[PDB]
Write an enzyme that holds these catalytic residues in place. Structure first.
Site, PDB file in Angstrom:
ATOM      1  N   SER A 155     -65.043 -43.482   3.030  1.00 22.00           N
ATOM      2  CA  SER A 155     -64.301 -43.963   4.105  1.00 22.00           C
ATOM      3  C   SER A 155     -64.290 -45.282   4.621  1.00 22.00           C
ATOM      4  O   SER A 155     -63.373 -45.749   5.263  1.00 22.00           O
ATOM      5  CB  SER A 155     -64.052 -42.871   5.286  1.00 22.00           C
ATOM      6  OG  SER A 155     -63.193 -42.933   6.124  1.00 22.00           O
ATOM      7  N   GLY A 156     -65.225 -46.099   4.412  1.00 22.51           N
ATOM      8  CA  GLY A 156     -65.237 -47.617   4.483  1.00 22.51           C
ATOM      9  C   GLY A 156     -64.454 -48.245   3.270  1.00 22.51           C
ATOM     10  O   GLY A 156     -64.702 -49.374   3.535  1.00 22.51           O
ATOM     11  N   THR A 160     -56.968 -46.125   3.901  1.00 19.59           N
ATOM     12  CA  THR A 160     -55.895 -45.953   4.840  1.00 19.59           C
ATOM     13  C   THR A 160     -54.968 -47.355   4.817  1.00 19.59           C
ATOM     14  O   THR A 160     -53.857 -47.462   5.189  1.00 19.59           O
ATOM     15  CB  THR A 160     -56.355 -45.975   6.201  1.00 19.59           C
ATOM     16  OG1 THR A 160     -57.233 -46.709   6.786  1.00 19.59           O
ATOM     17  CG2 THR A 160     -56.890 -44.422   6.338  1.00 19.59           C
ATOM     18  N   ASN A 204     -72.670 -43.443   6.002  1.00 21.80           N
ATOM     19  CA  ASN A 204     -71.997 -44.187   6.566  1.00 21.80           C
ATOM     20  C   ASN A 204     -71.180 -43.516   8.117  1.00 21.80           C
ATOM     21  O   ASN A 204     -71.171 -42.456   8.076  1.00 21.80           O
ATOM     22  CB  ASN A 204     -70.669 -45.012   5.886  1.00 21.80           C
ATOM     23  CG  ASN A 204     -69.678 -43.826   5.870  1.00 21.80           C
ATOM     24  OD1 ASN A 204     -69.738 -42.765   5.139  1.00 21.80           O
ATOM     25  ND2 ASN A 204     -68.578 -43.936   6.478  1.00 21.80           N
ATOM     26  N   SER A 207     -67.688 -41.469   8.974  1.00 21.73           N
ATOM     27  CA  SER A 207     -67.137 -40.775   7.538  1.00 21.73           C
ATOM     28  C   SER A 207     -66.058 -39.876   7.798  1.00 21.73           C
ATOM     29  O   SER A 207     -65.833 -39.034   9.151  1.00 21.73           O
ATOM     30  CB  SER A 207     -68.239 -39.961   7.050  1.00 21.73           C
ATOM     31  OG  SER A 207     -68.027 -39.261   5.805  1.00 21.73           O
ATOM     32  N   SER A 208     -64.864 -39.431   7.305  1.00 21.96           N
ATOM     33  CA  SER A 208     -63.992 -38.544   7.335  1.00 21.96           C
ATOM     34  C   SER A 208     -64.406 -37.282   6.512  1.00 21.96           C
ATOM     35  O   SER A 208     -64.777 -37.187   5.523  1.00 21.96           O
ATOM     36  CB  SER A 208     -62.751 -38.848   7.105  1.00 21.96           C
ATOM     37  OG  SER A 208     -62.619 -39.210   5.494  1.00 21.96           O
ATOM     38  N   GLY A 430     -64.645 -38.895  -1.649  1.00 21.77           N
ATOM     39  CA  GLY A 430     -65.242 -39.105  -3.082  1.00 21.77           C
ATOM     40  C   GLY A 430     -66.451 -38.291  -3.374  1.00 21.77           C
ATOM     41  O   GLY A 430     -67.215 -37.624  -2.336  1.00 21.77           O
ATOM     42  N   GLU A 432     -70.177 -36.998  -3.589  1.00 23.87           N
ATOM     43  CA  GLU A 432     -71.079 -37.274  -2.555  1.00 23.87           C
ATOM     44  C   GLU A 432     -72.419 -36.610  -2.876  1.00 23.87           C
ATOM     45  O   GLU A 432     -72.654 -35.466  -2.849  1.00 23.87           O
ATOM     46  CB  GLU A 432     -70.414 -36.617  -1.131  1.00 23.87           C
ATOM     47  CG  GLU A 432     -71.206 -37.082   0.082  1.00 23.87           C
ATOM     48  CD  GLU A 432     -70.680 -36.805   1.234  1.00 23.87           C
ATOM     49  OE1 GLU A 432     -69.545 -36.990   1.434  1.00 23.87           O
ATOM     50  OE2 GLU A 432     -71.421 -35.724   2.079  1.00 23.87           O
TER      51      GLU A 432
END
Ligand SMILES: C/C1=C\[C@H](C)C[C@H](C)OC(=O)C[C@H](c2ccc(O)cc2)NC(=O)[C@@H](Cc2c(Br)[nH]c3ccccc23)N(C)C(=O)[C@H](C)NC(=O)[C@@H](C)C1
Ligand SMILES: Nc1ncnc2c1ncn2[C@@H]1O[C@H](COP(=O)(O)OP(=O)(O)O)[C@@H](O)[C@H]1O
Ligand SMILES: [Mg+2]
Lengths: 749, 371, 139
Positions: A155-156, A160, A204, A207-208, A430, A432
C-alpha cells in the site's frame, strides 16, 4: 557455445542480488575466469551455468519480453536503467504494466499527454498509465464489453495515485468534468475508507486490509455519468485480535486520541492501552503521525462527502460501544457456565451507549438460546464460548458499520441516470509473507493466487488468439495452470475446509488440526510440506515462494458465530437512529470467517469474469521513501510479490520474441550474402535462418511476424557481432599497413 | 448437497436437515388404523394415519408402534413412517439427499440390514450411514471423553468412550424405559381406582408421566412424608375436563429406574449399571468417566434425576474423587444434534456408504463400513 | 628470404633504427613488417613476439637476425569484398559510419589515422566507392 571470451555474466552477491562480470577464457567441459567492473574465480557444481547477459541493444527497450535472456538479473537491470538513469517509471511486461513509484512528483501526468495518447494504438508509444486507460476506454467503444483495471502492490507503492490518474484520464477524454465531477468526490472519499479500512502491519504502516473496487458509469455518449463503489475481502479477524507491532483499524486510535475533547465527553474513552482490543499489540503510536489531528481530517472528509454529524456521532458512539464491549470481563461460576459480576463497570457503560437495558445483555451474554420448532431452551455457555461470542458480535457490528458507510458513500456518489456500460478500477493487496505467517496472510495469499489463476488464463487465451491470426499451431504454446494449488486450498478436504471442520468438531485444537493436515496431504501432494523442526506449522508452495504458516492462532481466528438473540437486543434500542439500521436486510450467522471470505472472493471473481481485465503492478523501489533511490533487494522482493517474475518465467518458455521481416532485414542482411538474396522477403529469411540456426524447432515463420525462442536473438546478434568485428579487423590492419608503407617511403627520403 | 439426519426410536421420530440446530419435523412414531365401521358416505376414509394426525384422530383409531425396544418389528408399517417423513413433513425428495440413521447398540443384525435394503431399493437414497445413538451424544455435549447414559423409550444403555475410542467389552444395555415406566404407571394408578386400558388411554397416561412425575432425592423419606401429609398431592385434567388427584405415587413411578425390582426385573438401576460399566474399563480411564456423565433421551428429563444420581454414585463411589453429572436441557434432542454435527464434518464424507458399493457387495457392506 | 630480399629488408630495417645500435624495438617490428608488405593484426604481432610485457615491448631491442624469423612467421579477395559489402546496396558507404566503425570496433584506431587514410576518398554526399577504396588500399 554462447559463453566465449569477452562475453558477460551475472553472479550472486551479499548486498545486491546480481553483479556483472566477464569471461576471460572460453568455457569448455570446474572454474570460470572473471573480471569485475578485482578478479574472481566462479566455480560450478550440480550441473548448472550462470545467467548470461543480454546483448546491449535490447537493454532499455520498452518491453521486458523483448529481451532474449529473460531472468531475474535482466529484469532487475532493465528496470534499474529505466528508473535511475532515464527517469522513465512505467514499463511493460507482456500486457502487464509495471509502475515503479517515484516519491518525486513528475510532469508526465499533465493534461496534454492525455490528448496525445487518446488516438494512438497500444504499442505505438512510450508506456504510461494513460496507455492502459487508452486501451480500456477504446475497447469499451470498439466492443460492448465492460473493462476493468487491476492494481497490486504494497500500500506504500502508489496504487491510489494510479487510480486517481486513471480516473482523470477518463474525465478529460469525456470532456465532461465541468458538467459534473465524480473525481473530486471519489478522491475526497479516500480518508474515510482508509480510516475504516487500514491497519499498521509489521512491514509497513498504513497497510490496507480490504479489496476496494470502484465502478464508473458512462453515458451512451461515453461521457462520465457517475461512480459506484464496492468492497470485498475485508479482514474481520483483526478487530478483536492482533499480532505484536500491529494495531487495530486506525479509527479506534484516532477516537481514543480524542478522549480529551468535550465533543465526545460521554464515551468515557481512555488512553488506548486501556481497552482490550487496542492494547494487545503493545504499539499505540504510529511513528511520525499525530492521531488527534487526523481525527479532524476524517470528520471533515465525512462532512464533505455528505454525512450529517447526527450520523457521525452515532458512528463514534458505536465504536466506543465496541471498545467497552471489548473490556467486558467474565468469570466462571462452574466449568460449564459463566457469569458477570454485579454492577460491572464496562457493561454498565456499554448498555448506556447502546441504550439497551442492562439485564437483557447480562442474560444473553451469559446464556445461549436454542429454539426448536415447538419449544424453547435457554442454555448456559462456558467462559470460552462466551468470549468467542462477544468477539463475534464485535466483528459483526464492525462489518455492518463498514457496509453502511460504503452504502452512504455510494448514496453520495451514486447519481442515477441510465448506465450504458461501465469501466472498473480495483485495488488489492499483493502476495504477502513475513517472518511469521498467520490466517490473515493465508487468506491474502489465497486471494492473490486465485487472481493469478485468472491472469494466467487470460494471458494464455490472448496469445492463443494472437497465434490464431498468423496460422500457427497450438502445440507450440502450452497453458500453465495453478489449479493444483487452488484445489489444495479451496476444495473440500482443503486447508480451509479442514479448518472449518475443526471449528465444529468437539475439543478442537490447532495441534489436532495440524495433525489432520499431515494425515491428509503430507505424503500425497507435492505442494504441501511439513517443516522439519516443528509440528506447529505447515508449508505451501505458491507461484512466488514457499511459505510457512504457523498454526498457533489459526483456529481461534476462524471462529465466527453470532447468537441471534444478542443482536436482537441491540436491534431493539430506541435511543438513536443508526443502531436499529445497521442490522437491517439467517444462516450466515453460522458461517466461519474462512467460509465468508471464500464466498466474498468468488463474488469478486464473478464480478471480474464478466469483464476483460487490464493490469497494473506497483513496486516500492526503496524501503525508506528516498525521493529517488533504488534498492535491489527490495525490488527483488516486490517483483516476486507482484508475480511479474512468474509472468516472465511463463513467457520465457514461450516464443517471447517476434520480428517483422522488413525490420529484421535491417540488421540481419549484414550476415546475408546479396549474391543469393531473393526478391521475396519471407522466402529470403526462410532460406537464411535455416542456415544460421541449426534446428527448426527453435523458430516459426508466420505471415507478418517471425517467432524466436528465448535464446536465439542473442545468438544471432553475437554471430553478427563476431562477423562484423572480424571484417573490421581486416580493414583496420590493411589501412595501418598502407600508412606504414607511406611512412617507410618517408624513411627512404 | 446437504444431508438428511433422522432419528427413530420407539418414541418421537426426530428428523431435519444437517447443519440445523434443532429438528425441522418432530412427530410421534405411530401408525394407526380405524377399528370402527365407517358409517358416513364420503367420510374420506383413509387406510392409515401417521404421526400428528393419529394424535388428533386417536379416539376413533387404534395405535401401534412399529418399533419395540430398539427393534423394528413390522416393516411395511415402518415404511409408511419413513414415507411420511420425507414426503409429507420435510417435503424433500430422498433421491437428492444423503441420509443418516441411528440405532441402539447390540441390536439384531437384521434390523440394520433391512433398514439399509429399504433405503437403497425403495427410496433410492444416494448414500447412507448408521450411527450408534450413544456416540452422537458426545458430539452434542462437546466432548470426546465420558460415559454416556442414554435412555428414552425403548432401550436404555451405557456406552463408555475415552478420547475417541469406544470400549465394546463395556457396553451395557437395559430395557427399562419410558414405555415400561408408562405401563408401571398404569398398574400403580389402578390402586387409586383409575384405569386406562386402550392404547389411546395409554397416551393419556404418558402425558401424566411427562407432566406430574419427579424423582425424590431420597425415597423412603418422601414415601413416609406423603402418607403424613397431603402437600405432595397434585391434580390434573383429562381431555374432557374431569379431574384426577395423584399422590405419593407420582414420585414412586420413576423410582423403578433406580430399582428395577418393582417392575419385576432382577437388574440394578441405572446408577449401578453405570458403576458396573465403569468397573469393566481400566483405572487408566476410570477417573475421567467419573469426571463426565452425559445424559441423553427423554426419560432423563425427570426433574431431579441428576441430583439423585450424583448422590447415589458418590455414596457408592470411592470417597475421595469428584463425581460430576452433566445434563443439558437440550438432551431430549442431543442425539439428533450430534447427528447434525457428524453429518456436516468433512472427514465423514469419505465414510458414506454409496449406491455403487452396495450394488457391488450387497447389504452386507453396512456392517463392515459402519461399525 | 633470399640474399636480395634480405638486403632490401635489412636496408629497410636500418631505416627504422632510431638509436644507431643496429636494432629496432619490438613495438616497431610490426611497423617494419607492414612497411615490408606484411599485414599482421596486433594479436598476430603480439603472438609472434611472445606476448611481451610492456617494459620489453617499449625498451628491449633486437637486431635483424632475431627479427627475421618473426617476419618469416608472420609472412607464413572475395572476403575483403564481402567485408566492404557489409557497409554498403548501391555501392556506397557513409563517411560517418565508416569512421565510427573504424574508431569504435575491433582494434580501434585514432580519428587522425582514419581521417588520413580517408582523405580524398569520400565524395560530396560523403560516400565511398568501396571497390575503388579497396583496390587503393591493396595497391
Ligand atoms: C424365546 C426366545 C426368543 C425369541 C422369541 C426367539 C426368536 C426366534 O428370536 C428372533 O429371532 C425374534 C426377534 C427378532 C426381531 C427382529 C429381527 O430383525 C430379528 C429377530 N427378537 C426378539 O423377539 C427379542 C427382542 C429383544 C429384546 Br426384548 N431385547 C433384545 C436385545 C438384543 C436383541 C434383541 C432383543 N426378544 C423379545 C427376545 O429374545 C426374548 C426376550 N427372548 C426370550 O424370552 C428367550 C426365552 C428366548
Ligand atoms: N418432560 C419429560 N419428562 C419425562 N419424560 C418425558 C418427557 N418428555 C418426554 N418424555 C418421555 O420420553 C420418552 C421418549 O424418549 P426419547 O429418547 O425422546 O425418544 P427417542 O428414543 O425416540 O429419541 C417417552 O416415553 C416420553 O413420554
Ligand atoms: Mg432416542
Amino acid at each position: 557455445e554462447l559463453y566465449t571470451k569477452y562475453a558477460r555474466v551475472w553472479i550472486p552477491d551479499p548486498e545486491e542480488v546480481w553483479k556483472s562480470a566477464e569471461l576471460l577464457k572460453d568455457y569448455k567441459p570446474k572454474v570460470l575466469q572473471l573480471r569485475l567492473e578485482k578478479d574472481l574465480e566462479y566455480c560450478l557444481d550440480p550441473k548448472e551455468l550462470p545467467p548470461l547477459r543480454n546483448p546491449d541493444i535490447l537493454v532499455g527497450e520498452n518491453d521486458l519480453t523483448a529481451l532474449s535472456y529473460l531472468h531475474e538479473p535482466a529484469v532487475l537491470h532493465n528496470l534499474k536503467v529505466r528508473f535511475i538513469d532515464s527517469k522513465l517509471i512505467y514499463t511493460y511486461c507482456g500486457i502487464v504494466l509495471v509502475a515503479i513509484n517515484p516519491y518525486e512528483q513528475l510532469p508526465i501526468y499533465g493534461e496534454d499527454i492525455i490528448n496525445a495518447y487518446s488516438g494512438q494504438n497500444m504499442g505505438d508509444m512510450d508506456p504510461h498509465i494513460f496507455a492502459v486507460a487508452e486501451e480500456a476506454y477504446k475497447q469499451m467503444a470498439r466492443d460492448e464489453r465492460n473493462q476493468s483495471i487491476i492494481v497490486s502492490g504494497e500500500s506504500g507503492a502508489g496504487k491510489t495515485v494510479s487510480a486517481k490518474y486513471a480516473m482523470r484520464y477518463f474525465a478529460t477524454v469525456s470532456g465532461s468534468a465541468s458538467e459534473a465531477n465524480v473525481e473530486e468526490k471519489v478522491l475526497a472519499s479516500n480518508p474515510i475508507m482508509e480510516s475504516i479500512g487500514n491497519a499498521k502491519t509489521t512491514r509497513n504502516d498504513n497497510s490496507s486490509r480490504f479489496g476496494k473496487y470502484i465502478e464508473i458509469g458512462f453515458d451512451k455518449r461515453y461521457r462520465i455519468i457517475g461512480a459506484n463503489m464496492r468492497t470485498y475481502l475485508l479482514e474481520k479477524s483483526r478487530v478483536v485480535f492482533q499480532a505484536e507491532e500491529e494495531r487495530n483499524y486506525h479509527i479506534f486510535y484516532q477516537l481514543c486520541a480524542s478522549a480529551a475533547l468535550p465533543e465526545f465527553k460521554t464515551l468515557r474513552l481512555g488512553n488506548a492501552n486501556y481497552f482490550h482490543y487496542t492494547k494487545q499489540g503493545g504499539s499505540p503510536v504510529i511513528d511520525g503521525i499525530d492521531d488527534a489531528k487526523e481525527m479532524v481530517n476524517t470528520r471533515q472528509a465525512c462532512t464533505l462527502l455528505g454525512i450529517s454529524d447526527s450520523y457521525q456521532m452515532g458512528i463514534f458512539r458505536i465504536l466506543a460501544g465496541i471498545l467497552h464491549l471489548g473490556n467486558v470481563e467474565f468469570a466462571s461460576r462452574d466449568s460449564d457456565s459463566c457469569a458477570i459480576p454485579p454492577k460491572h463497570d464496562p457493561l454498565t457503560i456499554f448498555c448506556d451507549l447502546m441504550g439497551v437495558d442492562y439485564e437483557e445483555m447480562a442474560h444473553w451474554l451469559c446464556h445461549r438460546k436454542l429454539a426448536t420448532a415447538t419449544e424453547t431452551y435457554i442454555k448456559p455457555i462456558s467462559k470460552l464460548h462466551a468470549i468467542n461470542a462477544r468477539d463475534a458480535l464485535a466483528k459483526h457490528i464492525y462489518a455492518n458499520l463498514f457496509n453502511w458507510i460504503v452504502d452512504h458513500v455510494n448514496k453520495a456518489l451514486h447519481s442515477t441516470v441510465k448506465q450504458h456500460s461501465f469501466i472498473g478500477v480495483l485495488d488489492i493487496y499483493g502476495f504477502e509473507t513475513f517472518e511469521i505467517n498467520s490466517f490473515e496472510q493465508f487468506c491474502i495469499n489465497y486471494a492473490n493466487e486465485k487472481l493469478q489463476q485468472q491472469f494466467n488464463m487470460h494471458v494464455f487465451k490472448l496469445e492463443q488468439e494472437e497465434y490464431m491470426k498468423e496460422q500457427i499451431p497450438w502445440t507450440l504454446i502450452d497453458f500453465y495452470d495453478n489449479q493444483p494449488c487452488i484445489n489444495l486450498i479451496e476444495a473440500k478436504m482443503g486447508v480451509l475446509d479442514l479448518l472449518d471442520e475443526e471449528c465444529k468438531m468437539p475439543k478442537g485444537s490447532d495441534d489436532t488440526w495440524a495433525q489432520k493436515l499431515y494425515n491428509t496431504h503430507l505424503n500425497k501432494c507435492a505442494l504441501f510440506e511439513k517443516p522439519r523442526l516443528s509440528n506447529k506449522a505447515f508449508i505451501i508452495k505458491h507461484f512466488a515462494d514457499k511459505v510457512e504458516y504457523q498454526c498457533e492462532g489459526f483456529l481461534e481466528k476462524n471462529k465466527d458465530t453470532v447468537y441471534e438473540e444478542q443482536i436482537k437486543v441491540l436491534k431493539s434500542s430506541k435511543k438513536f437512529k443508526l443502531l436499529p439500521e445497521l442490522f437491517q436486510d439467517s444462516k450466515e450467522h453460522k458461517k466461519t470467517v474462512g467460509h465468508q471470505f471464500r464466498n466474498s472472493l468468488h463474488l469478486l471473481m464473478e464480478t471480474l469474469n464478466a469483464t476483460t481485465p487490464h493490469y497494473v503492478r506497483c513496486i516500492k523501489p526503496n524501503d525508506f521513501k528516498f525521493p529517488f533511490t533504488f534498492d535491489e533487494k527490495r525490488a527483488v522482493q516486490q517483483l516476486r510479490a507482484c508475480g511479474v517474475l512468474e509472468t516472465i518465467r511463463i513467457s520465457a518458455a514461450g516464443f517471447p520474441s517476434r520480428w517483422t521481416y522488413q525490420e529484421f532485414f535491417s540488421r540481419y542482411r549484414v550476415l546475408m550474402k546479396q549474391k543469393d538474396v531473393l526478391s521475396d522477403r519471407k522466402q529470403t529469411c526462410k532460406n537464411v535462418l535455416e542456415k544460421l540456426i541449426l534446428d527448426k524447432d527453435k523458430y516459426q515463420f508466420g505471415k507478418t511476424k517471425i517467432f524466436f525462442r528465448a535464446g536465439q536473438v542473442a545468438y544471432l546478434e553475437k554471430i553478427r557481432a563476431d562477423k562484423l568485428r572480424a571484417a573490421c579487423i581486416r580493414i583496420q590492419k590493411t589501412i595501418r599497413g598502407w600508412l606504414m608503407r607511406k611512412k617507410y617511403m618517408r624513411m627512404r627520403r | 448437497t446437504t444431508a438428511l439426519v433422522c432419528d427413530n426410536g420407539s418414541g418421537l421420530v426426530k428428523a431435519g436437515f444437517a447443519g440445523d440446530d434443532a429438528p425441522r419435523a418432530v412427530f410421534p412414531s405411530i401408525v394407526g388404523r380405524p377399528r370402527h365401521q365407517g358409517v358416513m358416505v364420503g367420510m374420506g376414509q383413509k387406510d392409515s394415519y401417521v404421526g400428528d394426525e393419529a394424535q388428533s384422530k386417536r379416539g376413533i383409531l387404534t395405535l401401534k408402534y412399529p418399533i419395540e425396544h430398539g427393534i423394528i418389528t413390522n416393516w411395511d408399517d415402518m415404511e409408511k413412517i419413513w414415507h411420511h417423513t420425507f414426503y409429507n413433513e420435510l417435503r424433500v425428495a430422498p433421491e437428492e439427499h444423503p441420509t443418516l440413521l441411528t440405532e441402539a447398540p447390540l441390536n439384531p443384525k437384521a434390523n440394520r440390514e433391512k433398514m439399509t435394503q429399504i433405503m437403497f431399493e425403495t427410496f433410492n437414497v444416494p448414500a447412507m450411514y448408521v450411527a450408534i445413538q450413544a456416540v452422537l451424544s458426545l458430539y452434542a455435549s462437546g466432548r470426546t471423553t465420558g460415559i454416556v447414559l442414554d435412555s428414552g423409550d425403548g432401550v436404555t444403555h451405557n456406552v463408555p468412550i475415552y478420547e475417541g475410542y469406544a470400549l465394546p467389552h463395556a457396553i451395557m444395555r437395559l430395557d427399562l424405559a419410558g414405555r415400561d415406566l408408562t405401563d408401571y404407571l398404569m398398574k400403580i394408578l389402578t390402586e387409586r381406582g383409575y384405569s386406562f386400558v386402550t392404547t389411546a388411554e395409554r397416551e393419556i397416561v404418558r402425558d401424566i408421566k411427562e407432566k406430574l412425575c419427579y424423582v425424590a432425592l431420597d425415597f423412603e423419606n418422601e414415601m413416609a412424608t406423603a402418607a403424613s401429609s397431603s402437600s405432595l398431592e397434585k391434580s390434573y385434567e383429562l381431555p374432557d375436563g374431569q379431574v384426577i388427584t395423584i399422590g405419593n405415587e407420582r414420585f414412586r413411578c420413576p423410582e423403578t429406574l433406580f430399582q428395577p425390582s418393582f417392575i419385576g426385573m432382577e437388574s440394578a438401576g441405572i446408577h449401578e449399571t453405570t458403576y458396573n460399566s465403569i468397573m469393566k474399563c481400566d483405572i487408566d480411564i476410570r477417573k475421567d468417566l467419573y469426571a463426565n456423565n452425559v445424559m441423553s433421551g427423554g426419560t432423563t428429563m425427570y426433574p431431579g434425576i441428576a441430583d439423585r444420581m450424583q448422590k447415589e454414585i458418590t455414596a457408592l463411589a470411592p470417597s475421595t474423587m469428584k463425581i460430576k453429572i452433566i445434563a443439558p436441557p437440550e438432551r431430549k434432542y442431543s442425539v439428533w444434534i450430534g447427528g447434525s454435527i457428524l453429518a456436516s464434518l468433512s472427514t465423514f464424507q469419505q465414510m458414506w456408504i454409496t449406491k455403487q458399493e452396495y450394488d457391488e457387495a450387497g447389504p452386507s457392506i453396512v456392517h463392515r463400513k459402519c461399525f | 628470404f633470399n640474399k636480395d630480399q634480405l638486403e632490401e629488408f635489412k636496408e629497410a630495417f636500418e631505416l627504422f633504427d632510431r638509436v644507431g645500435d643496429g636494432k629496432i624495438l619490438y613495438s616497431q617490428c610490426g611497423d617494419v613488417m607492414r612497411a615490408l608488405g606484411q599485414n599482421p593484426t596486433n594479436a598476430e604481432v603480439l603472438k609472434v613476439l611472445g606476448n611481451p610485457k610492456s617494459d620489453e615491448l617499449k625498451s628491449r631491442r633486437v637486431d635483424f637476425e632475431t627479427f627475421l624469423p618473426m617476419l618469416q612467421a608472420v609472412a607464413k579477395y572475395e572476403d575483403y569484398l564481402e567485408g566492404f559489402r557489409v557497409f554498403d546496396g548501391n555501392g556506397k558507404v557513409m563517411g560517418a559510419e565508416l569512421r565510427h566503425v573504424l574508431t569504435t570496433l575491433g582494434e580501434k584506431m585514432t580519428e587522425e589515422e582514419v581521417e588520413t587514410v580517408l582523405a580524398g576518398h569520400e565524395d560530396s554526399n560523403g560516400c565511398i566507392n568501396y571497390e575503388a577504396f579497396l583496390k587503393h588500399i591493396l595497391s
